[PDB]
Amino acid sequence: VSTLIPPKVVSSKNIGSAPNAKRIANVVHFYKSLPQGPAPAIKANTRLARYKAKYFDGDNASGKPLWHFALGIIAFGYSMEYYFH
């Protein structure tokens, strides 16, 4: 007898599976995606964007800024020692 009409009806496979949710996510995310992100920090300029760039970038974490930062406070109180003495 005469075949039923379901095989030629589709209209809820688009909620029917899980990658639909991911699809509607990644059509927004990827379509308006940039090839590369914006920045790993770069502001501190006054001849100190260089200080941050050399020391406090993702390029390295090394003891050089620590030494520098320590020395600033040492220079304050060391001069003040002779202001107190």
Binding site: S2, P7, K8, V10, K13, S17, P19
Partner: protein, 52 residues
């Protein structure tokens, strides 16, 4: 998701073919009924003729 989609694509055309084909077949059986009544009339006639 593409995999899911692809199955349905091939189905969409071909299913319309079977849908038609099935109904086409049903028409053929109608004509087969005409044959069936012919078959009967002959059988009955042969049987009486055998009795004679």
């Amino acid at each position: 998701r593409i995999d899911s989609v692809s199955q349905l694509q091939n189905v969409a055309e071909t299913t319309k073919v079977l849908f038609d084909v099935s109904k086409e077949t049903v028409e053929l059986e109608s004509e087969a009924f005409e044959l069936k009544q012919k078959v009967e009339l002959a059988h009955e006639a042969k049987a009486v003729l055998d009795s004679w």
